[PDB]
Structure formats: C-alpha cells, structure tokens
Amino acid sequence: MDVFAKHAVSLESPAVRHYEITPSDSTDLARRPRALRVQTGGTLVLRDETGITVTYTVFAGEILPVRPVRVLATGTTATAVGWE
Amino acid sequence: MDVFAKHAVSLESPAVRHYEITPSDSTDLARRPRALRVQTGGTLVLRDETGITVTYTVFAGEILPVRPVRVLATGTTATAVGWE
Amino acid sequence: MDVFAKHAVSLESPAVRHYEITPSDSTDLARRPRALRVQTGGTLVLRDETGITVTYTVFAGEILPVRPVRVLATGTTATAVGWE
Amino acid sequence: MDVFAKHAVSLESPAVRHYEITPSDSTDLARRPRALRVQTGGTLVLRDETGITVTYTVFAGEILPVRPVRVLATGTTATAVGWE
Amino acid sequence: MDVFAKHAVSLESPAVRHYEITPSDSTDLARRPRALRVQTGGTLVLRDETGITVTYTVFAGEILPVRPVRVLATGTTATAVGWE
C-alpha cells in the first residue's frame, strides 16, 4: 500500500524499477536507466545518445546520476545495476 | 526505449550528455556543463561567467554540482568529465 | 553555449556563481550562498538571519546545503568557498 | 544581499535556519527540522509524529533527510544540529 | 511547530515517516518506502512491482533512493529501515 501511488514518477524521483545491466557492446540497452547503482568497483564505459563515450573510474557502491544509452564491454570491469 | 522521452531535461535532472573536458586556459568551453564528474583526484581551477576563479582541492570520484564556464590549466592537476 | 540558458536558476539548481569566503566576523557576507563547498577540513561557525550560531565540525571536501548570512572568525579553522 | 530572496523555501531547498538540538526525551522539539546534520558519530533515537521510533547508527558528518518530531535521550550517544 | 505544515510531501521531499523493515520473503511490505536507510552493512535483495530482483552489496550507513515492493530474506544479510 503506497501512499504515493497517485504521484507521477519524475527523473528526480526515487528508483521505482531496477534491472541489472550487462556490458552489451554495440547492442543498445532495453530501457535506458535514470541512474546506475554500481555493484563492484572498477572501470566502465558509457555511451550517450549522441555517441560520444568516456571511461568512468567508478568506485564500489556509488550511484551515478547519468542516463546512458549503451554500456560497452571493451573497458568495462565494473558491474552495475540500472535504476529507472 | 526510454519511458522518460517526453520528459523535459531540467538542471536537477540526471546527466543526459557527457563529454570529457580539457584544461583549456583562456579559451572557453564548448558547452558549459551542469556538473563535473572527476576522474583523477587533485586540484582544478574553475571560472564563472562573472570571471572570479578559485582552486578546488577535489577528490577522486566526486561529482560537484557546479556550472563552470572555463576550466583553466594553470593549477589544474585533476582530470574531469563534464555532464550536461 | 549553454542549452540551459533559458532555464531559471532555483535553489535546487547547480552552482552558477562561486566566490571564496573569508571569516569576516561581525561584517556580513556580500551575497549569502546557497551552499558551501569546504576546501580544508576543520571547524567553522555560521550565523543565520535569525542570529543563532553553531559550530560545524566539517570534513575536507563536503558540500553542505546551508544558507548562512555570516561566517565568523572565532572558531573558524576551515576554509570554504561559497556557491550561488 | 541574496538574489534568491523572493524565492520560496521548500522542503527540497537548502537549509535556511539551523539550531542545535538536545536529546529532550518526552518533551517535543520546538520546531521539527527538515534535516539533521550530525556533529559527533554514534547512535541516536528518533520519533515520528505517528509515534514509532528506531535507533539510527549514524556516522560522523552525515546529513540525514529525516523530519523527526522528538529526539529521545535513552539511546542517543550522537550529537546533531537541526536544519530548517 | 512545523513551518512547513502546509507544504505537500513529494517523493523528493525529506523523510516524514520511518519504520524498520523485516526481510519478509514472499509477503509484501505494509507500505513501500521512498528510500531505505541501511543500519548494518551487507547484502540485501529487493523486488520491484514488476517482479525482477537483484542483490545489492550495500554499505553501512548509506541511503539508497530505491522504492522497493518486497525485501526477501534469502540473500538479505543487511538490516535497513524504511523512509516514507
């Protein structure tokens, strides 16, 4: 029983739906997440919708409020779970 | 397939577009970012649109919700990636 | 070239303008900041508009989302930079 | 001189007014805070308006975005300052 | 005496009501929380309303802005308290 059932889910709102992501590498994600909760620290590579990609030296349990289209598997050493 | 496609991207919203920044030093940035994800810890210098600049002793993986116009290269030891 | 130029700058929005603060002690600040980025960890004292003051045992790089009128110099050991 | 003087102060907005809290124990707080900045790490007990209470094993400088009615003194080892 | 009594409590707003959660395991929660304050670090498993579940290797005092329907007891080693 949620008292916030009638409330709309914005981008700023907490994570309603979560799904673990795989480093898919040139196949885009099913749904692009609002944020990424990292499970294991390391490096992971992220691509925008505009196509430019950088490597993120991420830590262990950080949330990073980025909205990626595709996570590639070349430099990805870090496992994450998407939030949406 | 984003379910938040129709939603407007505010300043408070997560990072849609990311690009790595270079310490340009008296040439302004292409697009000023909403936030800066730091890659390597150190010091970096940031200038507003009003012109005043300070040095930030930043840590390794911090996001700092500042909106800088130009990152100079005099005291910049820290590499960052912009979020927008 | 900012794509968020037409957007209004709220209190929740990121830091547009930054200026380093001095522990002024019974002279109020020029502009009161939305937040304080701390440069060097320590203690610093903060006064509201209602006048009551407490000491904050702050850490090194923390942002603290407080909106102070005056930073006094009695117990201030920590250097900070204001965000607005 | 605040440029945000005309802006309304919401719950999401930064801390305008701060006051140190005492572990009052069956006398309610003067004003209930939007958030609690912890000064010294430890344990502290918090009561809602509905009456249920839990112990929080809090750390040193954390802010916790909880809105408590009364802080009791039974299990409170941690000193905090309220934000409002 | 709250000065924010007339304000509506959104998802982005601070925690008004808190209750400790038990790892119920195939009985859903009474009220689903806006966020989870973790008490003791470890692993805990969380299920959405859509049914998919992942394990979260969470730390000690972190808040995680996820909105879970049910916390199962299979892989849950971490105690948390819900915020709403």
């Binding site: 981008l11 609002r34 | 997560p14 919700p65 | 929740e12 990121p14 989302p65 | 999401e12 958030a35 | -």
Partner: peptide
C-alpha cells in the same frame, strides 16, 4: 546540492 532523497544531479 540540497536535502532531497532523489538519485539526482543537484
């Protein structure tokens, strides 16, 4: 920046 619980940028 401020006191929300929101997974967000600022």
């Amino acid at each position: 920046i401020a006191l929300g619980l929101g997974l967000g940028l600022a």
